[PDB]
Amino acid sequence: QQKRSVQDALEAQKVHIRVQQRKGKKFVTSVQGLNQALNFRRISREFQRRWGCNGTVIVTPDAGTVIQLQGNWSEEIKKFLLDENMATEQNLEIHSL
């Protein structure tokens, strides 16, 4: 009840996005902070098909179920998680630009 509600609506769940550059004008992008329950294969395979990209479903020690993409995308990696209960609009880090 209320307890869980709070413990969830005000704690944990913090959603990282980042952008970097491979070279010249080539770029890369990641996402982290998404819950284990969700199938990563289904989100990654969406992003891809909606624009020439390239995903992954990488699992890294103590940071795992972290997925990256090819190209600079920051805007749409925020936009798509806003309407979709994936980011309480409060946990949205951008490290781009």
For residue 82, state whether it binds another protein (rule: CB under 8 A). no
For residue 84, state whether it binds another protein (rule: CB under 8 A). no
Q: CB under 8 Å to 21, separation ≥6 — which residues? A: 27, 28
List beta partners, residue 33. none
Minimum CB distance to another protein, residue 66 (Å): 5
For residue 72, state whether it binds another protein (rule: CB under 8 A). no
For residue 92, state whether it binds another protein (rule: CB under 8 A). no
CA-to-CA separations, 72 to 5, 6, 8, 77, in angstroms, rounded: 35, 35, 31, 10
Q: Which two tokens stand for residue 15?
A: 């959603």
For residue 32, state whether it binds another protein (rule: CB under 8 A). yes
Minimum CB distance to another protein, residue 15 (Å): 11
Stretch that binds another protein, among 21-29, 40-48, 76-84 (CB under 8 A): 21-29
Q: Which of helix, strand or coil describes residue 43?
A: helix
